[PDB]
Amino acid sequence: RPLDIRPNLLVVPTTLRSKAKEVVGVQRLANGADNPNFELVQVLDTAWLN
Amino acid sequence: FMADEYRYGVRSRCNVGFGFWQLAAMSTEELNQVNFEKVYDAMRNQKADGG
């Protein structure tokens, strides 16, 4: 049976904040192609690790 | 004619500033994500004493 997971939190170090925002927060990823994950997972940044 | 001053600046906090940029905004990640974002993350990842 599926677990029915609903990933909605993305926590990453500071160095990945910009890339995570690009993944979720803009329509184009890095080349004007598209962003299938736009407005999908709300990313919170964290600096307590790494 | 003379106009006196007795002021001076301070190199106050070197842990809250960044410099030495090869500034450019004309690449997917070669000039944006490696210069401006590098400075960004370096500024927001500073640790007072670790942790």
The secondary structure of A1-50 as a DSSP string is --------EEEE-GGGHHHHHHHTT-S--SSSS--TTTTTSEEEE--S--
- Give the separation between CA A17 and CA B46, rounded to whole angstroms: 14
* Chain B neighbors of A18, CB-CB under 8 A: 33, 37, 40-41
Contact: B40, A17; criterion CB under 8 Å: yes
Compute, in degrees rounded to 10, the torsion defined by CA atoms A22, A23, A25, A26.
70
Region of A18 on the Ramachandran plot (φ > 0 left; ψ -120 to 50 alpha; else beta) = alpha
B40: closest chain A residue by CA: A15
- Give the separation between CA A33 and CA A37, rounded to whole angstroms: 13
Å resolution of this model? Answer: 3.0
Contact: B45, A13; criterion CB under 8 Å: yes
Q: Please, are residues A20 and A43 in contact by the beta-carbon 8 Å criterion?
A: yes
* Chain B neighbors of A31, CB-CB under 8 A: 28
- SS3 state at B43: helix
